Amino acid sequence: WQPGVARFETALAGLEHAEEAVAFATGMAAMTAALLAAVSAGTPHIVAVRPLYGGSDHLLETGLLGTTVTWAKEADIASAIQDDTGLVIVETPANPSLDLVDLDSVVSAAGNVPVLVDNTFCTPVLQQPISHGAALVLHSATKYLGGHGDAMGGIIATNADWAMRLRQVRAITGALLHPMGAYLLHRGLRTLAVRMRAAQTTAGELAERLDAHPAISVVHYPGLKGQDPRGLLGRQMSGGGAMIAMELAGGFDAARSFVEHCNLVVHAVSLGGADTLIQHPASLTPGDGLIRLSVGLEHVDDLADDLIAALDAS
Amino acid sequence: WQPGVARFETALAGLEHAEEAVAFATGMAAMTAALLAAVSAGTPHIVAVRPLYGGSDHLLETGLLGTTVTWAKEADIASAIQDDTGLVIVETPANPSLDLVDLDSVVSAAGNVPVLVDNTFCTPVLQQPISHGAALVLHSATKYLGGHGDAMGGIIATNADWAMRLRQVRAITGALLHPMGAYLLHRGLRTLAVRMRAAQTTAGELAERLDAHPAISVVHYPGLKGQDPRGLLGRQMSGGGAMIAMELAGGFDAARSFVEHCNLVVHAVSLGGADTLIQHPASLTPGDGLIRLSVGLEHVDDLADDLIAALDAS
Amino acid sequence: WQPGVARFETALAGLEHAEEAVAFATGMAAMTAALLAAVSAGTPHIVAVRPLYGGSDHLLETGLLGTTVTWAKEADIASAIQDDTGLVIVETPANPSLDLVDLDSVVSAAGNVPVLVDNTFCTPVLQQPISHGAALVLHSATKYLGGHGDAMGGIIATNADWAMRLRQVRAITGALLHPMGAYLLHRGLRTLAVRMRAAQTTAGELAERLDAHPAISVVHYPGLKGQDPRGLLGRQMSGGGAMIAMELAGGFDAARSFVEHCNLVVHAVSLGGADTLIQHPASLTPGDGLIRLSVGLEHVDDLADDLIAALDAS
Amino acid sequence: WQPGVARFETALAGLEHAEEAVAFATGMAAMTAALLAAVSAGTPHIVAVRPLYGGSDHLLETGLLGTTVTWAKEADIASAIQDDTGLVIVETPANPSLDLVDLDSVVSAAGNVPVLVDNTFCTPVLQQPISHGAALVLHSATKYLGGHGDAMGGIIATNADWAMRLRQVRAITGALLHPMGAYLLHRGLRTLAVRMRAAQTTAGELAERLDAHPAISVVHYPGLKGQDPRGLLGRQMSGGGAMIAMELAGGFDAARSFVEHCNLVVHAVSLGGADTLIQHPASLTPGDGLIRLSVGLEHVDDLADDLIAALDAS
């Protein structure tokens, strides 16, 4: 019953072109409510597509909320669907491999089963899952939506029935967004358009410079030459996005050495802000010689000068 | 992983004399986490003592979190305890009737089963359930702890094992307290001692004035003529508390007329803060002619003047 | 033109019984605006009463705003009033010696000259200078008004002409109160009545226990028998207030040793909060063996047990 | 002595390439402190360039702070400088006309007199006055620096001597920035680069479409059709900025009619945010048929379609 939460909810619902949106304390609380809404509806089975986000897959794997998950590849989602399947969870691009998922194909495979798309790294600026047929669109507002991640958040833009169902869970589960945090998110939402466009354009140029260096074997980025065999860019995505994932030829040995030599680019577990970030998945808990990268609002030449110098370690 | 949350957690743990405390977005989120922690531990049965708080009983009644509840009277809790019972939920004084529950007797009846006590209206100022043997002490920080209800909250002061279990649920459930909200709660915690003492002393005088009026049949307030037959005040409670329940002789007809005639005392769903409030549970969704009154910081004389004049108009 | 500032302004104006109030960023900004309003009115002379607050006297002494000050004793204010005198600045009780000033006598001496009273430590709860004839009442909102001092402030409760004059200065001087800071002050204003009453009652008992100890020569608290020869308590003040000053018999040697032995009471430059504070003017920049004390909301017995133990150790 | 203020101060000092910066409550407070620092230094004369910001010229015109102003054109600043001149105030581009001022020429004309440049609309993104020889650079942080104007501000990036002088004034004047407001400004500073670049690029396209319409006589936007005869763009400015001034051929009659027909672009006194704004100096208090523009983060096709349609209706 807060005003700051309502203004942020309708702002994101309009951005995603959804009927309404429901805001929660964190991204985890939004996923929890969506899962609990399916369980309460007498439909606790979830067909989740892998790759999926680190914290989100713990929720399904443990099955704390009384959920049963059957991991299925994108190509065969329909086969995994059971009579009690209530949701089809899918993250695009497939974090942290950055593989593109055809949302139109996923929705047709699900049929009468609602599809939940994690549009966290894409943002409504670079992807509209609702338009492809996704019933629900999940967000972890901390990354990109807020811009700085100082205020945590989680929101699902969906149709009226699923939104009412989510609000009912929120009512007794109590995972509410604080008005101060919602205010910071709605403030950052005004500049989302210019931030994602600038971060995507600097990421595209950065992706070209990374593959040219012999220190890394290849770098994953949808916008790169031949890294979109499906033709999903333009049809589904605005561009290549602001996420770069690269594989080092030196393996785990060169990965940790490359991270410590970076001065401008810093290391963090949560990624997706105004500052450029890197995260070694092997050095946190994925590939051993794999390094993740979230592109910020810095000058492309300043980032390239720092990454190339750190790669020169070998 | 927030600083403002940690400082509020340890402040309340010290007030309740518990090993540590775990803070959640709302009171509902704390109860949800406690219930989910019991379910995850392979013990989903809950022996709850009816009466219970309005929103808390819905969580058990629906059994959204995979819980099985067996409502039992205080006198026979031990009999209702099954092999899979993980918690004994009990609110004292029994909202809304304000019936006193002997915590020492409840803990002995539970035996090896952890006891969760809702100390929301009592606050650590007027009741220490931990000292009586309660394993967990739940709070809805919105009422009394914060002082104004501007910042929502929910916290459980408990031993290290249950606190670690609650933190694990919080980690994937994501029902986190916003640092701004935690700051406002910790700020209000400094003045909790002088607020509850002043509210309790003005409620004790108000309870005497209400029973004297012929408009109401009986007034429920622990610190009154023969209203404490168990000898729980002094032994368990500091005084009579700041809550007063009252049943109007006119039934529902005079009860709603008493609410609409009140100008100073406000009609609200949430009750407990720096102001005096009245709630009619029969008009809201309990008994037909029962009004619940949360004593505030106002002067006893001017507080009696508004209530007595509203009673004069049926 | 902020909403949070307006609600705090009218709340304090009502507390002080003034027509309206003007809020500034800090206490210094309020004094600066009052001084600049007098200078702009073609009346830059100020008759200030000694003693005065540390930072406020620097403003007059330097004469940065184009002011000419004539420091005068309470007894001969009328004689120091020149043709161009626009204000009579006076703080009561005289910080830091705590000497009571008869406001009724000061106003009669000033005559047609407006009187500005620093009611910071007294608060509208324990003193109403407006009722005695003071044209303006200055406050440093951080101390006592806010309760914790987390949000800085400065406000002057005065008549419409002086308030319009102050608003005009604020308009081009730009020393505005931030709405967030004003919100925290207005929130703390709700509990001001119960906090000052509880801090005053605990200070009165603490002063009796302090004089009894042979470690200190003379305790200073206008309230203890004999420390009010003018009969100002009751007539002007509510009680003795929450400020206790004292002089150690051991001089500067015993003064610093007593401060380090305190565990519950902490030392700070700014005072007037929920926690009990102590301040040594000699060890900060007055007398060599003199200590200051801001009584908080702690239990009188808990404060006396720590203070007496610290006094015992020289 | 606040943490949030210090981090914002050093961030802006680095952006402007100044030794240090001093932050105040509002832009007016920063100008007031700069003027008071000159007055206190025994140098109260100010040579200000005509034209100047609306509120800033009132401070000099009234001479509240004990200042004497001699308004002079850019071409003859040196002649207006007297023995007691302590500052040379200059705004570039000269609002409202948007005329470019050669900072290198102004600094040479001032010689030993410190030069204060109001870089509010240019921001460190599009102009570095420090590099041209300006001793002080004033900002009204509300406009552009914050991005939304929700948190007010004022800051001067200057050398160590002038910064120490400003801090000394701030110390007794008390026009402090609230930490919450400073936090919002420092948060918005991270996105300043992408916001000013995007607003400048859409303003450059907008000015081309405005001059083509016969409703307006001549548009004022630095570097549109050889509107920069001095060669100041590139040498001093990054581009044309986000400000466009325009004179209607219909005079005051067409000026008010064009404002009411606008739906997307809104009217306000304070200008410089994420949203596009228009202002009529004649209808507020300059030329009779002149309007200004604060280009925001909207798409150029959305702004042009709205402005051209409003121009069609007189």
Swiss-Prot record, chains A, B, C, D:
Catalytic activity as recorded in UniProt: L-methionine + H2O = methanethiol + 2-oxobutanoate + NH4(+); L-homocysteine + H2O = 2-oxobutanoate + hydrogen sulfide + NH4(+) + H(+)
Enzyme Commission identifier(s): 4.4.1.11, 4.4.1.2
Record-listed pyridoxal 5'-phosphate binding positions: 27-28, 140-142
Entry's Gene Ontology BP terms: cysteine biosynthetic process via cystathionine; transsulfuration
Notes on how activity is controlled: Is inhibited in vitro by carbonyl reagents, completely inactivated by DL-propargylglycine, and unaffected by metal-chelating agents.
Temperature dependence: Optimum temperature is 25 degrees Celsius. Is active between 5 and 50 degrees Celsius.
Described function: Catalyzes the alpha,gamma-elimination of L-methionine to produce methanethiol, 2-oxobutanoate and ammonia. May be responsible for the production of methanethiol associated with desirable Cheddar-type sulfur notes during cheese ripening. Is also able to catalyze the alpha,gamma-elimination of L-homocysteine and DL-selenomethionine, but has no activity toward L-cysteine, L-cystathionine, S-adenosyl-L-homocysteine and D-methionine.
Subunit structure and binding partners: Homotetramer.
Protein name: L-methionine gamma-lyase
Lineage: Bacteria, Bacillati, Actinomycetota, Actinomycetes, Micrococcales
Residues of the full protein shown: 80 to 402 of 406
